[PDB]
């Protein structure tokens, strides 16, 4: 099903400030891929968003309660599983 190097799905777009919901079942324990161990979304780390053929890159900006939308906090003020990615660039052909 979901291959390796999978984190979550985009759930909000505000032009150049994306919000992502982590789908990892609390397994932020040094996820391993290709003989090396990376860490689930971190402040200074990069993420990749593939759109069909080209991949959109980005850099995480804020992790925790800050990334949750305005009123999702008012609905459930105890669920903090969001990150706030800011787009940077993309790879061409």
């Amino acid at each position: 099903t979901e291959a390796s190097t999978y984190i979550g799905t985009v759930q909000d777009v505000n032009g150049a400030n994306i919000r992502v919901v982590l789908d990892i079942n609390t397994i932020s324990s040094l996820k391993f891929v290709d003989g090396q161990g990376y860490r689930i979304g971190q402040i200074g780390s990069f993420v990749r968003i593939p759109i069909g053929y080209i991949n959109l890159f980005g850099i995480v900006s804020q992790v925790g309660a800050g990334a949750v939308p305005d009123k999702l906090l008012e609905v459930e003020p105890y669920g903090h599983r969001w990150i706030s990615v800011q787009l940077v660039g993309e790879e061409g052909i």
């Binding site: 291959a3 390796s4 290709d34 003989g35």
Partner: protein, 346 residues
Amino acid sequence: SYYDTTQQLSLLKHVLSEDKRPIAFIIAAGCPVSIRHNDAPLIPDVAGLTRKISDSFDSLLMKIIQNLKTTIPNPTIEDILSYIRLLQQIPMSGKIHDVENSVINALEESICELIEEEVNVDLPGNATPYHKIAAWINSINREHQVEIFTTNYDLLMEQALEELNVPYFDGFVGSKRAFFDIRTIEENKLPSRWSKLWKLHGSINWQLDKQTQTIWRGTPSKGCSLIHPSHLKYMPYLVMMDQLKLFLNQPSAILITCGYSYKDQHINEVLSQGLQTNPNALIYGLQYDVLENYQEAKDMALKRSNLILLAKDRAIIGKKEGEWKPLFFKLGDFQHLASFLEEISQ
């Protein structure tokens, strides 16, 4: 083209410090040779057993060696034992060596007696590496218990794990005869505290009672043992290998091999199948030798990406061979690995 030891050790320490991931071990014959009781090694490696058999026993032995070498390289004890049992399968097999049979049946018993008397060496004091491993096992109340697989015929694991009384289960249930159970292996409905130890190549205390064709473990009898590597009985081997394969399919599973030479064939294939089936599986191959001496390990590393092979001088990671950054990586030795485990325990 270059690797650094410190980052690899840091990654391994990070891996071992997670209780969510199930952990296992492979204790091959390379661990007992790493501890010295007398001036001689406590338990010699497979080459040591072959040399001891050669110099201890003659004409028919040399004839058998020549027959097997006619199409095979330097043999092992498993090879000659399998050849002997294959000959025993055929009733009128005594004409191959012109010995009229009924003599091989006694030669194999003599070899079994010699091996079973040689391997019974007892464990030295509480400073053994196996004691450190056992102490590390119960140090943390992990939610997934650690399983142990051993190819050794001896009982060093048993003595070490009982000297520091820890939960233990090897498949046999009972007190007087210790009848082997199969169902309780398959439901896997046991409390998480109980540890699991499994011997793939058989122990020395195993006795085949014949008669009803049942297997049981307990006190080691004289001459009667079940040292068989795989055997071809009409079985613990198949179900236990199935258990290993089932373990390798668990999500985010880590398996560490210490002192393993990768010269076996079925083990390598089941490991490759497990690695290919679940890409999240991860195997740490630890060796104490030059990397050029493990061709099968090199092939597996170049084939399976999620297998990490680390040798004294070179290391291949992610289908890319390389060399250490200025022998290094003393973690291949069993003593150093045990010290590492006991220092990370606290």
